[PDB]
Amino acid sequence: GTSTIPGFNQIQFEGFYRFIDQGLIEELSKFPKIEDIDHEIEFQLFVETYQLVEPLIKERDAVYESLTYSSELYVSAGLIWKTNRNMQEQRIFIGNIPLMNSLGTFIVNGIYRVVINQILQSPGIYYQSELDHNGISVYTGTIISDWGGRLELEIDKKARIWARVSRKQKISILVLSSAMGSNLREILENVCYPEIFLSFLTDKEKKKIGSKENAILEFYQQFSCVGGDPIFSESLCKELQKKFFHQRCELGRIGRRNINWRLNLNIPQNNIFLLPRDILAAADHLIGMKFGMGTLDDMNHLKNKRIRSVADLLQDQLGLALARLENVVKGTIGGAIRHKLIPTPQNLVTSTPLTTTYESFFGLHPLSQVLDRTNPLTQIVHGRKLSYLGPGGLTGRTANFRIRDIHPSHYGRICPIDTSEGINVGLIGSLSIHARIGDWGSLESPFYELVEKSKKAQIRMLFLSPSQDEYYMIAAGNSLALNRGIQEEQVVPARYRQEFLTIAWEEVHLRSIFPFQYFSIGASLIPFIEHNDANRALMSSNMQRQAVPLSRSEKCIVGTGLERQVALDSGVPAIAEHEGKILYTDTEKIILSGNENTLSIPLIMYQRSNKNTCMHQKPQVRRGKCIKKGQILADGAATVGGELALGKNVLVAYMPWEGYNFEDAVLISECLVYGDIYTSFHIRKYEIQTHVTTQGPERITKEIPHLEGRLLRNLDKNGIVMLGSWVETGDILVGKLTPSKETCLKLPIGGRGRVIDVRWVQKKGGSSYNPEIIRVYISQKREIKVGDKVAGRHGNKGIISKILPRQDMPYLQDGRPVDMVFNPLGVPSRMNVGQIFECSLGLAGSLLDRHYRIAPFDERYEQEASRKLVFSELYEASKQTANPWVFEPEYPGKSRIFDGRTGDPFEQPVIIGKPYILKLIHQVDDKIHGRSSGHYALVTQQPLRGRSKQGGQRVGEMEVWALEGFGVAHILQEMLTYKSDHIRARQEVLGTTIIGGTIPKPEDAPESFRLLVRELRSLALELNHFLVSEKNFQINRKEV
Amino acid sequence: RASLNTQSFISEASFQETARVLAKAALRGRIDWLKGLKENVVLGGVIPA
Amino acid sequence: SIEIWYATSEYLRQEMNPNFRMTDPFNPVHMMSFSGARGNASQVHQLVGMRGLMSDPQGQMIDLPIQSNLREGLSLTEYIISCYGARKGVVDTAVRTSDAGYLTRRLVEVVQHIVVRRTDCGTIRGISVSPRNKSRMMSERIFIQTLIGRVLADDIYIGSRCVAFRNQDLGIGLVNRFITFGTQSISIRTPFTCRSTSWICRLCYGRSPTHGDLVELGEAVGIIAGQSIGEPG
Amino acid sequence: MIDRYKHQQLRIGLVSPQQISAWATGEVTKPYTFHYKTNKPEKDGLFCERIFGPIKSGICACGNYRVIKFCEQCGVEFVDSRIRRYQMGYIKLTCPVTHVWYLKRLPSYIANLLDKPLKELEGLVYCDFSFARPITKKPTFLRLRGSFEYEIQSWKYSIPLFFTTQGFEIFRNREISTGAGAIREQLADLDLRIIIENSLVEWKQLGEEDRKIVRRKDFLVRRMELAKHFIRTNIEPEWMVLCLLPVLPPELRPDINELYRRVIYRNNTLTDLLVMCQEKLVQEAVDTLLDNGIRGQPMRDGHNKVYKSFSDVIEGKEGRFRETLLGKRVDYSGRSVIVVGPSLSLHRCGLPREIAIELFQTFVIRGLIRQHLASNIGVAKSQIREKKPIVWEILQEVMQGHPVLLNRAPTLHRLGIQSFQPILVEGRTICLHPLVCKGFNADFDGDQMAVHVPLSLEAQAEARLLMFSHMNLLSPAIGDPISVPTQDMLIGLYVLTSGTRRGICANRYNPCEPFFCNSYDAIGAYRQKRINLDSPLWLRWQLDQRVIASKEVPIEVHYESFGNYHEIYAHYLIVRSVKKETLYIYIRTTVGHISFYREIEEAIQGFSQAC
Amino acid sequence: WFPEEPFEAFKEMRERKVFDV
DNA sequence: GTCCTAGGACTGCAATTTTAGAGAGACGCGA
DNA sequence: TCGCGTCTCTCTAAAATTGCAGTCCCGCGCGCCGTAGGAC
RNA sequence: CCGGCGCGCG
Ligand SMILES: [Mg+2]
Ligand SMILES: [Zn+2]
């Protein structure tokens, strides 16, 4: 990535390859040579013989029939029978290792999965100081190991150092130092203040310090807080070593690196353990820093972080996989020994440990997520996320408020705009376009080096880690400035030590020259982004991820030039793997032949995503065309000519129109409807499973009792809906009988469409019955409608509220009616001026037959660079096409338009143009819900929750407050008793309303109060409701 | 604190520290006369407003 | 550097409106904000003036001004700096809601039982309101809006003539008459004067906040009080 | 007026073992939930059909049926399965176990009533400590005081050997005891009045004499306050230690069943022995069942997940009080995306056909049956499912005069839910008036609303007469109007009422307009493109001077020698005479001011004429 | 503010009609 | 394959952990 | 022949940290994954 | 028709 934008999946690609090379070998080691208690039978692995074989199932087959794309592991083992003194070595089977796709995603059970990166505090020593209740400064040094073990060194009020381990367990330094054997004599000499340590030496501690073992026992007493005197034993040290030394004393390669720096130590790199000198050296700075010597450690600095890729997550699970295998073998070797048998090495090892722990890692781990396949943009941005959450990371409630903020070390590594919305704001990041993961878990970005005359400097592009980022003067300006002096004395803005300066060019070390350096993919697809407020940039990035691929796609007139990068790295288009010539093309395949190698590339035709969006590919080449390796062969969904195409170019005006664009409503024309401009295909999947019950297995048949032939009209003989049938709401999909009650699969509400794919498949198993699975895929052609959501690339979103005939829309001076009308009041409050630039230039490009791919921040060349570009291109289109309304000298970009209802011009000129508008997933037909009555919960007896469950709407406490504010005491009682949970009164309301005979008061308690009474009874508490008559003062006990 | 020293234990129990409120009230046979708005919401009855 | 660019930024904002009023009264940006429809002077200044100065998360201001507006186009350095305030707005949203929602629930909780249940508790106490204080010249605007809708706890006299009687709603005409003459003491019935903390009466509350007349029996004024304070939080 | 008195109360109280038996009478003895094969309720188990009631109402554990008392073989009642939601059981604990709420919670009630440090009671109940002299109402002969941690050597061998076994055990639990049984014995024989008097006299002694000299006083005040409440109530202080354990009905626990099993798992083990360790295991099983998380480390399951107790399920934001009781999900409710309708009236809303037909389904059934177009309820429902064209006529008829309630999600004040008159609109979106968006804090960029239908006549009257928007034009916070024109309407009004260009913005050079008889002539001339919206004009005024203008004298008075004089102001011209009493007024204005004034005037006059 | 002096505070309460003899 | 089957941020507050304060029974030194 | 500061504890009044308890907007939509373990 | 985890919308 020194001279080009790197592949967006290159971090996933390189991480997985690192795991294959070094992760397997480094983890196949550490596998103990398993020996029995008697030492008779020794089982061991020959790690140098490890191998992986290519998967037997093809990657298309793995997802087609719900399998996992993985490869076999076939290491060899040697079992030693010292009874016979004979060796047997066989190629045993260890498990299956999942394989990453070239796109960077795994397949488990036929589900695409993505492993996202995690951010957590880097190992080393960290210095912090926190005020106490009285404001007295208290300094602290904290050791962080390779597994998150924190060893806190604290200075108390009496200057006594305590090696705090938990919230209560407190241990002095001298006991801890003498626990490992640091004699009390040498502790004093190696520090500048021997007096401080000696002042805290009570006569009780000195005796325990004098001998190595007494310090260990006292250290155990203070660490464990267990009454009594422990006995020194080998097991006690091992028990302590696993709990304390194994988790709090192994720094690792990274942990040693930082400690050598922060504590200024010349210790060899190979020492991956916390040397005892470091603790004593740390105490020197800790006490020394109290007297103004040094600076505190910045915990939010990126130089104190690490990034864990798929390489670290897959290797760690292999650490659990093989540790899970040894426990399997130990039980297996002990079992076979008790039978005095000779077991073959294959039978001592089963494939369950590796296969299951990887099967359950993608299923359950939060950092393993389902790939979002809404559009090509979502496929690539999902894999580039950085999260502080996950195991070992802070939770949203746990997260500090100083975190979630932008740190100066993020520049070029973490996008300052892209973040999640909600409680997880500032905790889910996103990598920049040019960001790279280094060899220490640190993020790097490339900078251009400016050096003196006498220097070779073969490559001047060097990637900079955040630790060395501060100590360089990095400029972002240009050298287009000259006065009567020389160029080196001209001043430019620069960054140095986490601040912004203004210094001369001769003092600049590095330059930031890449245009997309500081942004993620989402923010890098916004043209004229420098004219939009950064608040809307975050919203705009999210909306582009919700765009629906349209049945027909077209390229944007105005773009940034990153659309071609997105298309290439998404895998949606077909990319040649071999040079040659095109010989045959059609819908189902493309045939390419080159260098005596003839290949056949199939094309995806109307496939379904995880978000119910259609996938489809069309050829982009013709027969007889020469192709280079890596050039495009076909276009996929939301891709035209090798570019990302998420929307359409439509004629647009910015004016208020009779309140139908009030707030954020959008007025559109019928041309967008009958022209199929925003028509999208949506495919749902309906699955039914056959289970074996006590009465017998479920049966599938066309003959279903108590059903009409009209409902079953689309079924075949087997009992499944026919391929290519127009189903309806309530129609039958799979007829199934459970012994026999009808348990068939019916089409839900609003699911009417055309059946396009049926999959009657049996999962072969070891039982006498195999689970049968049926998958029905139904396509739905959705044209744009009132209530649909459209948005532009500048955070300008809106709901369609009105559709007009073309003769009613306002029209231009060439007579063409516009397609959309936007409210002009949405610009000043939202402060996104870049949409005004894009619409004017989109109009110019359509008349000039031009497309524009403009890199952001074009004002680095000159002032008002975007204005000069748009105005000059508007005038060129006006002059060439003889359309004087396209560029108006009086008011450039605006023109007088006419009312389609009266033919009279609107008084003020209107900004018109041809912007790029997207259609989003959030639309009606997926949000309209209604309920009369129906199914209730089993315990609370309240109506269910959810549109899919035909549930009701919740009247929460804030809604109850409003009803109490109005004083509507009878509306409130309805929503509390006989519309929610009063079982007796719900059935009477259903009866009276059908006869219209007045509803009486419930007067009894609802099932939610009776539920509470029983629970209070379970705590030996009785809650009785009494009514005292105002007539005769008789106490009446209410039934509850 | 003022909301935890009311004349109703149902309003206190449904506000905060339910176990603490109910343990103290049930030890002394505390009586709630349902004079408030939230007390009658819990029972599902008509609020006295 | 901080103060010279803050003074320059603030001077552009001041002259933005007279420039619009004198030279382009019908300018669309001016009309969209001067009419009170959508947008204020601060947001227009971000478009036509300069974005001014930002601040790093730990309070301190950044020693580099954003001297360009959104129409001109921010530089790469300026756009990064402007992302500091973008992050604050989204983060401060996640705490304005979770705190005000908690605050509103506790506000409604403490007064949920307060309902207008009597016409007159019979109290004689009255909070005294004085227009003239020798430590500060009272602003008549505050003296009015607080007194409107209150019920007098005592008779008001001008000379030997009674101009306002006990148990009489304080209209705006009476208040101006009190201000016009030298009426130094006004005794009103407030929620602080009712003879109960479990309910309130019609006279100690006053006129209805929405219905114009005196408040009606059975009105849940406590929940309305709790919602009125927590809503703008 | 005499108030309509209503005296209704509810009270909680600590329950008695006799009341627990009366609840269950019915004891759960086995930890079996269901048969592994048949999935039938195991007898005497947590789901026993004899104890709790008949599954599949009207059938026995055998399979017999009767029309909706006790069976003979299995002894199962003949009632509805409703009883399985309400019928309680109990577990007969071999040893009494203390209630965790009254021992471990701070400050401890048992510790304060017995007046011993909490650590001492905790050691007595959990550790292997024995308490000396547990009771006083029966004589003793030993001088053991306090709670000796170590077992007494003589009491272990000497005294039992001298006093043999039977009589020794007969008088055993009167000098030395341990666990919750000793605590219950101490609580049972307490003399509360003596407690009050001793506490008062000790308080006086302390007072007659400075942190813990006060903290001891506060304990004494707390203890005599605690002691007084037992005297006047029917609660007994020994009920804080449980002899029976009530069992939740099965239908409320279709986690909790796991904790109930452990109590039976360890209590039935204890009765087989009849040992100290198993007594503690039963006590910890009850604590985890009743309240986990108070004892430091809370007991987890096999998955290293903390168990959820009754205290956890009744407390917290997701507990019974704050989630099930203070808010409920309701029937006859819908939801959809809201779009703007500027043609709607202020008291109207638009409902999609699907939401309307779901919400008003029973009323549509009544309309169908009433006019003989449906034979029964089933036929009417089938017709509704088929989307017959006559279903929509009946729906449109029955929706007239029946209001609905709209509601946006963050209901911050009472105007967050309002009532409107629904009308049928095409599509799948809710049509909302633009002037009520500020009250809902709603904009049309993705917001959704919930709809509710009042059913009873009282609720419909409340919605129509209290919650409609035309009677809620003022906000309760300060009294300001809430339905004020905003944004587009405000801009339109501002442009309409922005008058003529004046001064140097009207004429290029220093000046060294039509006259209309009535406003209708001016508006007609504007329609015929004769004048612009802001071009100046003179309007003859035949009413009183009611034009808001600066209080200024005339710019110029043109006095004629015949008597007439013309007074020229900034915005009007007035013609007066000395011979006559005539007075003519001409207002200098635009078509926009005329249009605004005429709009408001015609609104008032049309509303008056329509009534 | 009511003055910190107790008798001045008493006189203030008499003038502000908070409390009287 | 499986059919039963047993780690924030703040506030509030009582609980340990001293710190101290006097203080006394037996006493080695001592008058 | 006792008398005298006082050696070595001695027991409690009075703060001084310190470990729990409690709490932390509302309302919607969607997907995935459970339900585990061992001698056959 | 039960709870956790992850992702979203207003
Ligand atoms: Mg909105
Ligand atoms: Zn009163």
mmCIF file of C-alpha atoms in Angstrom, chain A residues 315-418:
data_model
loop_
_atom_site.group_PDB
_atom_site.id
_atom_site.type_symbol
_atom_site.label_atom_id
_atom_site.label_comp_id
_atom_site.label_asym_id
_atom_site.label_seq_id
_atom_site.Cartn_x
_atom_site.Cartn_y
_atom_site.Cartn_z
ATOM 1 C CA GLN A 315 -4.875 -19.249 17.065
ATOM 2 C CA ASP A 316 -6.294 -18.747 20.568
ATOM 3 C CA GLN A 317 -9.181 -21.134 19.902
ATOM 4 C CA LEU A 318 -6.564 -23.641 18.748
ATOM 5 C CA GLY A 319 -5.042 -23.218 22.198
ATOM 6 C CA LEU A 320 -8.400 -24.285 23.612
ATOM 7 C CA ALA A 321 -8.839 -26.975 20.947
ATOM 8 C CA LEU A 322 -5.644 -28.887 21.731
ATOM 9 C CA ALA A 323 -5.986 -28.422 25.490
ATOM 10 C CA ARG A 324 -9.446 -29.931 25.016
ATOM 11 C CA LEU A 325 -7.880 -32.812 23.078
ATOM 12 C CA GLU A 326 -5.397 -33.772 25.807
ATOM 13 C CA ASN A 327 -8.247 -34.238 28.288
ATOM 14 C CA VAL A 328 -9.947 -36.482 25.725
ATOM 15 C CA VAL A 329 -6.779 -38.538 25.249
ATOM 16 C CA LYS A 330 -6.065 -38.796 28.987
ATOM 17 C CA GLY A 331 -9.484 -40.339 29.540
ATOM 18 C CA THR A 332 -8.977 -42.522 26.471
ATOM 19 C CA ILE A 333 -5.504 -43.797 27.388
ATOM 20 C CA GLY A 334 -6.625 -44.517 30.945
ATOM 21 C CA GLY A 335 -9.701 -46.353 29.704
ATOM 22 C CA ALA A 336 -7.772 -48.572 27.295
ATOM 23 C CA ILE A 337 -4.994 -49.235 29.828
ATOM 24 C CA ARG A 338 -7.504 -50.614 32.338
ATOM 25 C CA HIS A 339 -8.475 -53.135 29.631
ATOM 26 C CA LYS A 340 -4.799 -54.044 28.963
ATOM 27 C CA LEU A 341 -5.410 -53.511 25.235
ATOM 28 C CA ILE A 342 -3.162 -52.056 22.549
ATOM 29 C CA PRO A 343 -5.086 -49.119 21.027
ATOM 30 C CA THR A 344 -4.162 -47.752 17.633
ATOM 31 C CA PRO A 345 -3.140 -44.067 17.748
ATOM 32 C CA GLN A 346 -6.150 -43.128 15.607
ATOM 33 C CA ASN A 347 -8.609 -44.437 18.208
ATOM 34 C CA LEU A 348 -6.991 -42.419 21.013
ATOM 35 C CA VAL A 349 -7.930 -39.132 19.298
ATOM 36 C CA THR A 350 -11.366 -38.023 18.110
ATOM 37 C CA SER A 351 -12.111 -35.025 15.906
ATOM 38 C CA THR A 352 -14.664 -33.496 18.297
ATOM 39 C CA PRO A 353 -12.269 -31.155 20.213
ATOM 40 C CA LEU A 354 -11.037 -29.164 17.204
ATOM 41 C CA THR A 355 -14.232 -29.316 15.149
ATOM 42 C CA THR A 356 -16.648 -28.413 17.946
ATOM 43 C CA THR A 357 -14.610 -25.590 19.492
ATOM 44 C CA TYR A 358 -14.407 -23.941 16.062
ATOM 45 C CA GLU A 359 -18.052 -24.733 15.328
ATOM 46 C CA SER A 360 -18.999 -23.067 18.619
ATOM 47 C CA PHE A 361 -16.561 -20.168 18.226
ATOM 48 C CA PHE A 362 -18.333 -18.718 15.195
ATOM 49 C CA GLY A 363 -21.742 -19.518 16.666
ATOM 50 C CA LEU A 364 -21.310 -17.896 20.076
ATOM 51 C CA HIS A 365 -18.367 -15.482 20.128
ATOM 52 C CA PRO A 366 -19.444 -11.814 19.915
ATOM 53 C CA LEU A 367 -16.507 -10.927 17.651
ATOM 54 C CA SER A 368 -17.768 -13.513 15.139
ATOM 55 C CA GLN A 369 -20.701 -11.952 13.306
ATOM 56 C CA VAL A 370 -22.927 -12.800 10.372
ATOM 57 C CA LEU A 371 -21.739 -11.097 7.198
ATOM 58 C CA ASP A 372 -24.067 -8.283 6.146
ATOM 59 C CA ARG A 373 -24.898 -8.801 2.465
ATOM 60 C CA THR A 374 -27.355 -5.971 1.832
ATOM 61 C CA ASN A 375 -25.122 -4.437 -0.848
ATOM 62 C CA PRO A 376 -21.458 -4.612 -1.908
ATOM 63 C CA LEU A 377 -20.618 -1.755 0.472
ATOM 64 C CA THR A 378 -21.794 -3.710 3.527
ATOM 65 C CA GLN A 379 -19.799 -6.830 2.636
ATOM 66 C CA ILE A 380 -16.409 -5.107 2.954
ATOM 67 C CA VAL A 381 -16.962 -2.523 5.700
ATOM 68 C CA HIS A 382 -18.153 -5.189 8.159
ATOM 69 C CA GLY A 383 -14.734 -6.862 8.226
ATOM 70 C CA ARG A 384 -12.856 -3.617 8.919
ATOM 71 C CA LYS A 385 -14.497 -2.764 12.254
ATOM 72 C CA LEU A 386 -12.594 -2.188 15.493
ATOM 73 C CA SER A 387 -14.382 -2.905 18.769
ATOM 74 C CA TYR A 388 -13.509 -2.270 22.399
ATOM 75 C CA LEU A 389 -16.219 -4.773 23.388
ATOM 76 C CA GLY A 390 -15.940 -8.557 23.476
ATOM 77 C CA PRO A 391 -14.175 -10.809 25.975
ATOM 78 C CA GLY A 392 -11.311 -8.999 27.642
ATOM 79 C CA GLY A 393 -12.804 -5.647 26.651
ATOM 80 C CA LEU A 394 -14.844 -2.967 28.388
ATOM 81 C CA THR A 395 -18.637 -3.028 28.316
ATOM 82 C CA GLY A 396 -20.775 0.009 27.548
ATOM 83 C CA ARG A 397 -21.523 0.492 31.239
ATOM 84 C CA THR A 398 -17.883 -0.323 32.032
ATOM 85 C CA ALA A 399 -16.587 2.098 29.385
ATOM 86 C CA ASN A 400 -14.924 5.258 30.678
ATOM 87 C CA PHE A 401 -16.178 8.639 29.499
ATOM 88 C CA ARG A 402 -12.693 9.763 28.434
ATOM 89 C CA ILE A 403 -12.798 6.804 26.059
ATOM 90 C CA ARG A 404 -15.319 7.197 23.189
ATOM 91 C CA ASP A 405 -13.438 10.446 22.421
ATOM 92 C CA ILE A 406 -11.120 11.202 19.523
ATOM 93 C CA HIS A 407 -7.443 10.928 20.368
ATOM 94 C CA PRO A 408 -4.707 12.564 18.249
ATOM 95 C CA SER A 409 -3.071 9.146 17.806
ATOM 96 C CA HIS A 410 -6.115 8.024 15.783
ATOM 97 C CA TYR A 411 -5.268 10.193 12.765
ATOM 98 C CA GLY A 412 -4.732 7.943 9.756
ATOM 99 C CA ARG A 413 -5.513 4.770 11.725
ATOM 100 C CA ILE A 414 -9.068 5.029 13.108
ATOM 101 C CA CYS A 415 -11.700 7.024 11.245
ATOM 102 C CA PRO A 416 -12.818 9.987 13.396
ATOM 103 C CA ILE A 417 -16.299 9.994 11.828
ATOM 104 C CA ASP A 418 -17.428 6.365 11.668
#
